[PDB]
Design a protein around this ligand. Structure first.
Ligand SMILES: Nc1ncnc2c1ncn2[C@@H]1O[C@H](COP(=O)(O)OP(=O)(O)O)[C@@H](O)[C@H]1O
Ligand SMILES: Nc1ncnc2c1ncn2[C@@H]1O[C@H](COP(=O)(O)OP(=O)(O)O)[C@@H](O)[C@H]1O
Lengths: 498, 498
């Protein structure tokens, strides 16, 4: 016999990762192409969409030239950045650089939209945040500044991998998981928010068609075949937003499954059965549809995360231009066998925050310092404080029934932090290494089901897994005492607001 | 000719310092005897009074055996600990260990006294604090626990050097500066608080006679001559409390002269013309009489001072048993050329405080931390925060007309701190080295006037001074901006109180 593969891609924020997936869950011919970002962190966060496809071309070229036969690639499926704004003309050419999710320039427009429609009405219909990062504001903001370009507007792409899917098949579509993030989509009606788009003079024709991740969008076109070297007619599946693929990739499949992304920034996620939406949160809470039939990923986005620890390296003598390796090492060494006093408390919002609280301005403090306070206790309180933010998020997400938390990211390198998190959230943790491959595993599994390589996604992931860890469980604690420090921690955030 | 000398002593908290003073302001045959303190910092702070005299004997012996002729000693004068409680019997023997000023065990008794008499009445009459450290509470507390000993009570010594003066002459006296500290003395009537002592069943006979520092208490008695080797009849002057002698010693003589003691703990002092006492302060403010005719030293006692800096060495890696030298060095190096952000604020009450605020419990915090905050900025903010406490104290003392601040103590070793203090208090500083000799210079000068060696104290100090510095002046500042950070600093202390 001969090997067949699924071409998997992630169009991520800083790079494009790819691999050819065999039926046994093996990921081969792994590739990585770096993408540039524009804006220098002064407000704008943009990319040239062509770079994404350019990246896909380069990877496919490198595959054929590495002896891979494009006919043995039985399907193409991608994940990528969610919540983009990308305006295209009639020939599918960008009218503007892609504006990324982290761009939040349109403050006044989001304010207006919320005022005009009612925040409770919008929340009630979208089940998600309407903020400066949402697509409607970015679209309004753009129409006003570029009226000519706007005249030529024909399509609005809302996820990075959707553009590449467009380049490949010539059809404009997206997944419900990504749609959720946009603040343009109604989960309950399963449709774009018609009256809201019409009220601002935007046609439905601008919207992509909604598709299941496993549905075929179309086949690779003759032209795309010439551009990439894929075989014309090779199935291109819809795929899904990277949050969806990453969580699928690590086995987040069942009710009360949960996930934690601990990078420079982070997010905590709880999968559950789709329920009637509750009252507006006083903390940005996403509810992503479409990852599993009948289930919703409840996500709390965290802006102060692994960056809190990174900051604290200053405490052990780190300076602006130095490699951080030796300092993470000292910090870990120093907090060994240390205990944090009930009175010592670190509030970790060194940057503006969304969850668990809206803080447009930082609120960073070290409280309860006495003469007996050591630097080691400080370092630890930082981890504790960061973990208390996380417990706050879990409380918002309703995670009291979650048994196990899948953890990814560089943040998990702090053994001391993990311990803080398990203990304070009172949940077990399992670390999942190689976070860059996760969305690819998820995609490969959904593709495998569609190709009839496997009966289910679950079955697929569990096999690759025999291919290759000990769960970390919480120490026993004075529930009630950890709980009192937790409430005080809440009172401190409020009190620091004056 | 041949040298004549004044025997000067300071009966301090941790040691007895002494020297023979010539007429040119020279201090010779310097001695130091260490004293032990009992209580292990668990509440009690006591010493054996006999140790004080024992120390004086040993020093005088060492003088005669070093070729000094006791007849050339023309007067004996001492300073020492103020605000002691020392109960003696009819033979002048202690009925209890001397209870030092820092002892504050009698919480309930001070509370009772204040309730019974009115805090405003007491303040109005005593012009000083009535607290657990005051002599009346300690006396009540002692009578209740030792009724037998109390039956034998005949004299109550209120300053350490007064006991030694008692051992030397056989007369019981004290100075008005020390009397002030006791909460038993009425400045305006110039007398002990009769109704207050009588109301608690204590006779006036227990009180020492009030004397000027320069007045002769008596001559060395035959017996004391045998015990010490001094010449019988050698004048023993009354002398004064160490705060009085230390400030005299450095030239604090004129209205709006000021003084700063920056040790582990500290105090700030402003000399001014005796005025009608104002309303009770919400911050422990002493008003000491008797140092200069018609003038009053206004003192703010600080409990968080050089100990704040000492604590901060933890930040640069200091650990419990290590020598501190190299760490003070790094901290100084690290804050060089650094600026403290207007938003970064350190509240330095790592221990309970009296001035500028009553804080029975610590209130230590680092506020306004952002991601850009460095350790160096932290170190500096600590100094700034400590200095802001000091500015608060100056504001309480009414120091807006003070031109120059005489500074003593190990605290002054931080060049960076001095700069913070000058800038924030907006006053010039002059550091006075060898703080242990200060009370001796002061005593020697007052003695010199009495012996007709010099026409005035001022004249005396200014000469020794030709024997041997650049004043440090404040940088120009946005008054108004330093002032806004100062007010915020006040608001933060209150807000941290919940
Ligand atoms: N050696 C380490 N030990 C502890 N944490 C680490 C270490 N190195 C990196 N980190 C953490 O990794 C975080 C970023 O991880 P990462 O997964 O690359 O997220 P991101 O792609 O968002 O920057 C940092 O903020 C830091 O706290
Ligand atoms: N090398 C130094 N540099 C800066 N400050 C110093 C240094 N060494 C000692 N100190 C300060 O000295 C203070 C104590 O000084 P000191 O005059 O002996 O007062 P005390 O007798 O009350 O303990 C400490 O709290 C510390 O901050």
């Amino acid at each position: 016999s001969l090997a067949f593969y699924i071409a998997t891609f992630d169009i991520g924020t800083t790079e494009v990762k790819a691999a050819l997936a065999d039926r046994d869950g093996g990921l081969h011919f792994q590739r990585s192409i770096a993408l540039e970002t524009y804006g220098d962190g002064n407000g704008p966060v943009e990319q040239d969409a062509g770079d994404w496809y350019d990246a896909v071309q380069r990877i496919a070229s490198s595959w054929w030239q590495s002896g891979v036969d494009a006919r043995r690639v039985s399907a193409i499926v991608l994940s990528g950045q969610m919540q983009n704004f990308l305006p295209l003309d009639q020939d599918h050419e960008p009218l503007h650089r892609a504006v990324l999710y982290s761009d939040k320039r349109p403050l006044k427009e989001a304010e207006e939209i919320n005022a005009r429609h009612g925040a409770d009405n919008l929340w009630s219909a979208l089940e998600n945040p309407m903020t400066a990062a949402s697509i409607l504001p970015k679209l309004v903001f753009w129409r006003a500044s570029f009226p000519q370009a706007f005249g030529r507007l024909r399509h609005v792409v809302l996820g990075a991998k959707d553009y590449v899917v467009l380049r490949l098949t010539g059809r404009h579509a997206t997944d419900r998981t990504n749609a959720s993030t946009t603040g343009l989509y109604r989960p309950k009606d399963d449709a774009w928010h018609v009256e809201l788009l019409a009220d601002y003079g935007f046609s439905l024709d601008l919207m992509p068609r909604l598709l299941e991740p496993g549905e075929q969008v179309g086949g690779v076109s003759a032209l795309a075949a010439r551009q990439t070297g894929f075989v014309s007619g090779t199935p291109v599946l819809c795929g899904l937003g990277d949050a969806g693929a990453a969580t699928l990739g690590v086995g987040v499949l069942d009710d009360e499954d949960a996930y934690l992304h601990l990078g420079t920034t982070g997010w905590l996620a709880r999968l559950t059965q789709t329920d009637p939406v509750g009252d507006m949160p006083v903390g940005t809470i996403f509810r992503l549809a479409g990852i599993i039939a009948g289930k919703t990923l409840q996500v709390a986005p965290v802006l102060n995360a692994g960056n809190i620890l990174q900051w604290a390296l200053t405490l052990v003598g780190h300076r602006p231009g130095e490699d951080c390796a030796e300092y993470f090492h000292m910090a870990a060494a120093e907090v060994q066998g240390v205990t944090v006093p009930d009175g010592l408390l670190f509030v970790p919002y060194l940057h503006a925050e969304r969850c668990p609280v809206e803080l447009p301005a930082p609120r960073g403090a070290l409280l309860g310092v006495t003469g007996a306070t050591t630097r080691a206790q400080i370092l630890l309180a930082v981890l504790e404080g960061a973990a208390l933010s996380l417990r706050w998020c879990a409380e918002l997400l309703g995670m009291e029934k979650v048994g196990l938390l899948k953890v990814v990211g560089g943040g998990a390198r702090s053994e001391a932090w993990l311990r803080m998190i398990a203990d304070n959230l009172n949940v077990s943790l399992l670390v999942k290494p190689d976070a860059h491959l996760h969305p690819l595993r998820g995609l490969a599994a959904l593709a495998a089901v569609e190709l009839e390589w496997s009966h289910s996604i679950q079955d697929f992931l569990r096999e690759a897994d025999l291919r290759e860890s000990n769960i970390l469980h919480p120490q026993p604690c004075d529930e009630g005492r950890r709980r009192r420090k937790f409430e005080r921690f809440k009172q401190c955030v409020e009190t620091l607001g004056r």
